[PDB]
């Protein structure tokens, strides 16, 4: 039972599932994420105020 | 309580984290929010709160 629970359910969340993850909402020194400098992504994030 | 009064929500939360402090008594909204954006959710309140003097 416990080996099945370990190898089935509690899988590390290597996926962030978009930008609604509170880990990316409040980052730290561990999760470093970035985008290419001076591009549409930069413009979009700069425009959005939240 | 007055024997070891803390000072500041963040300081009291840190003291709880290390183990110097064992329990915190404060508002319900602030503690619900603290538990909401706590990284890893190690601290948990009791029930729905509003235990006394709603």
Curated annotation (Swiss-Prot), chain A:
Post-translational modification: NMDA is probably regulated by C-terminal phosphorylation of an isoform of NR1 by PKC. Its phosphorylated state is influenced by the formation of the NMDAR-PPP2CB complex and the NMDAR channel activity.
Domain of life: Eukaryota
Domain notes: A hydrophobic region that gives rise to the prediction of a transmembrane span does not cross the membrane, but is part of a discontinuously helical region that dips into the membrane and is probably part of the pore and of the selectivity filter.
Biological source species: Rattus norvegicus
Coiled coil: none
Entry binding sites for glycine: 40
Tissues in which the protein is found: Detected throughout the brain, in brain cortex, cerebellum, thalamus and olfactory bulb.
Organism phylogeny: Eukaryota, Metazoa, Chordata, Craniata, Vertebrata
Family of this protein: Belongs to the glutamate-gated ion channel (TC 1.A.10.1) family. NR1/GRIN1 subfamily.
Protein name: Glutamate receptor ionotropic, NMDA 1
Oligomeric form and interacting partners: Heterotetramer; the NMDAR subunits are modular and harbor tiered domains that function in concert to regulate opening and closing of the cation-selective ion channel pore. Forms heterotetrameric channels composed of two GluN1/zeta subunits (GRIN1), and two identical GluN2/epsilon subunits (GRIN2A, GRIN2B, GRIN2C or GRIN2D) or GluN3 subunits (GRIN3A or GRIN3B) (in vitro). Can also form heterotetrameric channels that contain at least two GluN1 subunits and at least two different GluN2 subunits (or a combination of one GluN2 and one GluN3 subunits) (in vitro).
From Swiss-Prot, chain B:
Domain of life: Eukaryota
Residues noted as binding L-glutamate in the record, renumbered to the chain: 27
Subcellular location: Cell projection, Dendritic spine; Cell membrane; Synapse; Postsynaptic cell membrane
UniProt-reported outcome of changing residue 26 to F/L/M: Strongly decreased sensitivity to glutamate
Tissue expression profile of the protein: Detected in brain cortex, olfactory bulb, hippocampus including the dentate gyrus, striatum, thalamus, superior colliculus, inferior colliculus, midbrain and cerebellum (at protein level). Detected in brain cortex, hypothalamus and cerebellum.
Domain remarks in the Swiss-Prot or TrEMBL record: Contains an N-terminal domain, a ligand-binding domain and a transmembrane domain. Agonist binding to the extracellular ligand-binding domains triggers channel gating. A hydrophobic region that gives rise to the prediction of a transmembrane span does not cross the membrane, but is part of a discontinuously helical region that dips into the membrane and is probably part of the pore and of the selectivity filter.
Family assignment from sequence similarity: Belongs to the glutamate-gated ion channel (TC 1.A.10.1) family. NR2A/GRIN2A subfamily.
Function according to Swiss-Prot or TrEMBL: Component of N-methyl-D-aspartate (NMDA) receptors (NMDARs) that function as heterotetrameric, ligand-gated cation channels with high calcium permeability and voltage-dependent block by Mg(2+). NMDARs participate in synaptic plasticity for learning and memory formation by contributing to the slow phase of excitatory postsynaptic current, long-term synaptic potentiation, and learning.
Assembly: Heterotetramer. Forms heterotetrameric channels composed of two GluN1/zeta subunits (GRIN1), and two identical GluN2/epsilon subunits (GRIN2A, GRIN2B, GRIN2C or GRIN2D) or GluN3 subunits (GRIN3A or GRIN3B) (in vitro). Can also form heterotetrameric channels that contain at least two GluN1 subunits and at least two different GluN2 subunits (or a combination of one GluN2 and one GluN3 subunits) (in vitro). In vivo, the subunit composition may depend on the expression levels of the different subunits. Found in a complex with GRIN1, GRIN3A and PPP2CB. Found in a complex with GRIN1 and GRIN3B.
Protein name (database record): Glutamate receptor ionotropic, NMDA 2A
Organism: Rattus norvegicus (Rat)
Segment of the intact protein contained: 705 to 758 of 1464
């Amino acid at each position: 039972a416990n080996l099945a629970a370990f190898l089935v359910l509690d899988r590390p969340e290597e996926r962030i599932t978009g930008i609604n993850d509170p880990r990316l909402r409040n980052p730290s020194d561990k999760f470093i994420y970035a985008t290419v400098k001076q591009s549409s992504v930069d413009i979009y994030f700069r425009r959005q105020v939240e | 309580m007055t024997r070891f009064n803390q000072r500041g929500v963040e300081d009291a939360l840190v003291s709880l984290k290390t183990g110097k402090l064992d329990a915190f008594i404060y508002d319900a909204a602030v503690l619900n929010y603290k538990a909401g954006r706590d990284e890893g959710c190690k601290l948990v309140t009791i029930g729905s709160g509003y235990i006394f003097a709603t």
